[PDB]
Structures are given as structure tokens and as C-alpha cells.
């Protein structure tokens, strides 16, 4: 009876990145502006691709 019970893990619920959207209108073309930052102001984020 392999009991691996009571692994008392604590998990966090805070999405660390934060994305702000800005829709620049233009004639026959379009532009998206994207402000990306961290959730809280002591945990910095690295980014790899978008």
C-alpha cells in the first residue's frame, strides 16, 4: 500500500504578467499597442516571445 499521502503543498494564484491593450485606428491598416509589466512591484518577469 504505497501511501504518498499528506504532501502538504502550497500553491500560488497570482498571474505574474499583465497586459494592457490599445487599439490604434488607421485608414485601411491597424495597430495594436501592448503594455506588458509584472503583477506586483517587487517580482520582475523575464519574457521570451510574444
Amino acid at each position: 500500500g504505497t501511501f504518498g499521502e499528506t504532501k502538504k503543498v502550497r500553491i500560488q494564484c497570482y498571474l505574474q504578467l499583465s497586459v494592457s491593450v490599445e487599439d490604434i485606428f488607421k485608414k485601411d491598416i491597424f495597430f495594436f499597442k501592448f503594455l506588458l509589466n509584472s503583477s506586483v512591484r517587487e517580482e520582475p518577469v523575464i519574457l521570451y516571445s510574444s
Partner: protein, 56 residues
């Protein structure tokens, strides 16, 4: 490259940096920071959010 750009050309800018003979001076900072700033030809100080302008 090619300074006649119409509207829709995402074009890379190339910067070549070389530290001088005063590379011997400081050396306790190992990183320095390079703000690229944007001026109009006639007027000055384009704000860095920069809509209807260069987007980066």
C-alpha cells in the same frame, strides 16, 4: 538602412558600440544603460508612448 520609408516597413536600426580608452576607469559597474531617444526633425521631445509616430 534605406532612409526613404513609405509607411509600412518595420525596419531594424543598427547600433555599433565600442568602449574607448577610458574603459580602464570605472569597472565596478559592468553594465550601462542606453536610452534611445526620438526627436522630430522640426520640433522636439516626442513622448515615448509615441502614437501616430514610430512604434517600437
Amino acid at each position: 538602412d534605406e532612409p526613404k520609408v513609405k509607411v509600412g516597413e518595420i525596419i531594424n536600426l543598427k547600433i555599433i558600440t565600442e568602449p574607448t580608452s577610458t574603459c580602464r576607469r570605472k569597472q565596478n559597474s559592468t553594465v550601462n544603460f542606453l536610452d534611445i531617444v526620438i526627436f522630430d526633425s522640426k520640433t522636439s521631445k516626442i513622448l515615448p508612448r509615441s502614437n501616430r509616430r514610430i512604434l517600437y
